[PDB]
Amino acid sequence: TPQELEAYGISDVHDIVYNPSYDLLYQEELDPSLTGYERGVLTNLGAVAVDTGIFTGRSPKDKYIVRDDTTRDTFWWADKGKNDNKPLSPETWQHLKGLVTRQLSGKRLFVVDAFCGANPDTRLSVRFITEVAWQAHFVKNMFIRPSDEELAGFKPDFIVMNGAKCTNPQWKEQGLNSENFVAFNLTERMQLIGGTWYGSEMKKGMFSMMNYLLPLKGIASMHCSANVGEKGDVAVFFGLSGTGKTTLSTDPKRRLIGDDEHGWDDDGVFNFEGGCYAKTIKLSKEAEPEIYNAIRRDALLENVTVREDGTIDFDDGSKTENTRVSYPIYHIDNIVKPVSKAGHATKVIFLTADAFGVLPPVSRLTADQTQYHFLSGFTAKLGITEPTPTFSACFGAAFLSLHPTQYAEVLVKRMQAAGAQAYLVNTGWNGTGKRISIKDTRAIIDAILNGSLDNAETFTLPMFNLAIPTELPGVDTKILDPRNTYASPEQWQEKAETLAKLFIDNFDKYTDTPAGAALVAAGPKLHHH
Ligand SMILES: Nc1ncnc2c1ncn2[C@@H]1O[C@H](COP(=O)(O)OP(=O)(O)OP(=O)(O)O)[C@@H](O)[C@H]1O
Ligand SMILES: [Mg+2]
Ligand SMILES: [Mn+2]
Numbered sequence: 001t002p003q004e005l006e007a008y009g010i011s012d013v014h015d016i017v018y019n020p021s022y023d024l025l026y027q028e029e030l031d032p033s034l035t036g037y038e039r040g041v042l043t044n045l046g047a048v049a050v051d052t053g054i055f056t057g058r059s060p061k062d063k064y065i066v067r068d069d070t071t072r073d074t075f076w077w078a079d080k081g082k083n084d085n086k087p088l089s090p091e092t093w094q095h096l097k098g099l100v101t102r103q104l105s106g107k108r109l110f111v112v113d114a115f116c117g118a119n120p121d122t123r124l125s126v127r128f129i130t131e132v133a134w135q136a137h138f139v140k141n142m143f144i145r146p147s148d149e150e151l152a153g154f155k156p157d158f159i160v161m162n163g164a165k166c167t168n169p170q171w172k173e174q175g176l177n178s179e180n181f182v183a184f185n186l187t188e189r190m191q192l193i194g195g196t197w198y199g200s201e202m203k204k205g206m207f208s209m210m211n212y213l214l215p216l217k218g219i220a221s222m223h224c225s226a227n228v229g230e231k232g233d234v235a236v237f238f239g240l241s242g243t244g245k246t247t248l249s250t251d252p253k254r255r256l257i258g259d260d261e262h263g264w265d266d267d268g269v270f271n272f273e274g275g276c277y278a279k280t281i282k283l284s285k286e287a288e289p290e291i292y293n294a295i296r297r298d299a300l301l302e303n304v305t306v307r308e309d310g311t312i313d314f315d316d317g318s319k320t321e322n323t324r325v326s327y328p329i330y331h332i333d334n335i336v337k338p339v340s341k342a343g344h345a346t347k348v349i350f351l352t353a354d355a356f357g358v359l360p361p362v363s364r365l366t367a368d369q370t371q372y373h374f375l376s377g378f379t380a381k382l383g384i385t386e387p388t389p390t391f392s393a394c395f396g397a398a399f400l401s402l403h404p405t406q407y408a409e410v411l412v413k414r415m416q417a418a419g420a421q422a423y424l425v426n427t428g429w430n431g432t433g434k435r436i437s438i439k440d441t442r443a444i445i446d447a448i449l450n451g452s453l454d455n456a457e458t459f460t461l462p463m464f465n466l467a468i469p470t471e472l473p474g475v476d477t478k479i480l481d482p483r484n485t486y487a488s489p490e491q492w493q494e495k496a497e498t499l500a501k502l503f504i505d506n507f508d509k510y511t512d513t514p515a516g517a518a519l520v521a522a523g524p525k526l527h528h529h
Contacts, residue, residue: 005109008159009101010129015108019151020136022298028133037197038132044310047325049301050134053164055196056303056320058204060398061177062196064088066185074216076403081509083397088183092174093192096183100163100192104129110136113154114143116206118270118340122219122263126206127156135162137300138199141275141326143206144340158209159190164197184208199302199326200277204399207261210272212401220264220410223396225249226257226271228342234269235449236262238395239351240379244427246278247438248351248445250290256335257342264345264414271340276332280304280323283314287438294331301325344418347449350395353428353435355380355387358492358499360482361436361475362444363424363466364453368522370422371412375404375510375519376503380428389499391506405516423448424466431485431492443474462493463500464524500524 002013017024029040029048040048065075067087078086110130117123128139139160146154167179180195182205191205207223214221224236225245234257237245246259258271259278278291280301285292295301302324305316317323329335336342350373352359365373377392393404400407415422425448427441447453447469458467461482471477483489503524510516 005129008129008161009097010109010161011101011105013105013107013109017108017110017136019113020110020133020140022140025133025137025140026297029137038134040134041306042310043301043306043312045295045312046297047295047299047301048134049304049306049312051319052199052302053197055180055198057322058198058201058398059180059182059196060084062180062182064176064181064183065401066090066093066183066187068187070187075212075401081393081404083400085401090185092176093183093185095170095174096168096181096192096194097190099166099168099194100161103163103166104131104161107131112136112139112143113151113156114139114145114274115150116143116158116210116272117263118144118272119263119265122214122265124206124209124213125155125157126160127158128160128162128202130162130164132162132164132197134300135164135197135199135202138326139202141298141300141328142203142273142277144274145328157189158206160193160202160205161190162193162202164193164195167195186212200324203273203277207272208399208401210261210263211399211407214263215402215406215410218265218410220407220414222262222264222411223260223394223399224262225259226262226269226342226345227251227254228257228336229254229449232343233347233449234342234345235347235349236269236345237349237351238374239427240353240377240390240392240395242279243351243353243379244441245351246276246291247288248427248441250276250278250288250332251442251445252290252334253446254334254449256329256332258329258340264411268341268343269345271329273329273340275326275328277324277326280314280325281317281321290332290334293333294327295325296331299325299327299331344414344420346418346420348415348420348422349445349448350374350422350424351427352379352424353381354378354426354499355382355385355429356389356495356499357429357431357433357485358482358496359424359426359464360461360466360468361426361430361440361479362448362453362472363461363468364458365422365424365466366522368519369466370415371408372507372519372522373424374408374411376507376523378503382429385433389502391502405510405513421454423453426482430479430482436479440475440479444472446474447472463496463526497526497529500526501529
């Protein structure tokens with residue numbers, strides 16, 4: 001009812017589109033009278049493509065959490081290690097809520113009810129409100145779509161109000177970063193968005209809320225993909241953006257659980273989402289056939305270049321390198337169903353893209369190295385190279401609402417109970433200045449998952465002290481030692497000392513506890529220069 005929407009503060013809504021169907025979203029997006037960033041275009045693959053506007057990725061500098069008596073003593077605050085949980089006053093929150101609700105008043109609104117979390121006992125019932133059809137399409141794809149029975153008794157736990165078309169004229173007076181905002185209030189259980197149209201703010205916004213609620217009751221909440229083999233063996237793949245979680249979990253030899261957000265409770269690993277959000281830059285049908293074949297009607301392409309004849313130039317990063325496609329998870333042929341969950345993970349894989357070309361393609365981690373590298377959360381990026389490091393705790397600090405050690409504690413507990421083994425995989429660069437091929441990386445993953453490596457003979461990489469298998473079927477043995485891809489081990493050593501120092505400085509903040517101090521021994525060792 002409009003009276004219900006009025007309770008949220010939204011007035012005078014003339015048209016309400018509740019639970020829009022995929023067919024209706026399709027015709028909404030292709031309405032030939034739409035102008036601006038609402039407009040979609042039809043590609044020859046059958047999927048609609050849209051432009052997300054000035055924002056082609058998340059805006060962490062615009063993310064704020066209301067600091068009140070619910071969040072004061074439990075949240076990981078940016079002003080109290082480096083994170084994006086910047087404190088917001090309740091008073092300023094109310095002005096922001098006024099901006100969004102006024103913007104959505106007097107509009108035709110899409111209302112999408114969905115779940116975050118595959119399990120009833122821990123899921124959030126989220127109600128999304130937007131005036132942009134492709135934003136409703138995004139959340140229909142990425143969250144769990146309820147059954148008709150579940151919709152009948154749907155009671156929202158959280159409300160997400162997307163006011164992308166409004167901006168905040170008072171941001172200077174309020175001490176905020178810009179006229180845009182992505183704000184959360186755990187007392188009202190609400191997310192507000194202004195200025196940025198980018199859909200994934202809602203996806204990662206609710207992920208951040210799961211990351212707050214689940215560990216506080218003993219459930220790991222993880223930035224990982226996950227899949228399961230025929231023998232019932234579950235694997236999770238942690239990693240930062242672009243390191244290969246979606247690419248590598250979408251494997252026809254295994255049943256996909258999910259590609260990005262999972263919990264781990266007493267029964268096992270469960271997906272938070274109802275879809276996958278794949279990168280499309282330079283997408284190769286031969287290298288990633290399952291992802292490519294998911295691009296069809298009801299998938300939603302973002303910021304790709306579409307030619308006059310409707311074909312897609314997947315290689316064109318002119319608008320952004322972060323070209324994306326969302327699709328409901330059943331667009332992948334080999335998935336777990338009807339519920340995206342499975343048992344306890346026994347293989348835990350940390351993906352990293354090492355632009356420094358130091359780390360080996362695959363290492364088998366000790367228990368302490370697992371905690372050290374989990375808290376470190378390393379990746380790096382590249383007419384100059386300039387390897388630029390990122391240390392993002394738990395491979396997802398941008399989404400952590402509690403302190404990193406709280407995620408580590410619950411993860412270790414779940415791993416120990418399951419007898420899980422951890423591995424570090426460099427999906428990035430070596431001495432060639434090229435990325436390891438997807439073919440080689442998939443073969444590495446195969447060798448991890450089939451037990452090939454759990455007792456294989458190893459040699460130890462200096463300084464990082466990582467155990468590397470001496471051989472691995474399907475991979476050229478030469479590349480297993482990263483020193484072999486340089487003219488001499490001396491070139492590698494110089495870059496390794498740079499990276500080791502980066503790790504050591506970054507890890508210092510964790511040494512104010514005895515447990516954290518103890519983990520220094522498992523990290524890289526550097527005592528000169
Ligand atoms: N050896 C490799 N392994 C994995 N991915 C690779 C490799 N070489 C190149 N790539 C490319 O790197 C990108 C990996 O992106 P992917 O979508 O898997 O990241 P992600 O970890 O899911 O990030 P996000 O959390 O942002 O979704 C893809 O564009 C893929 O084509
Ligand atoms: Mg992904
Ligand atoms: Mn992600």
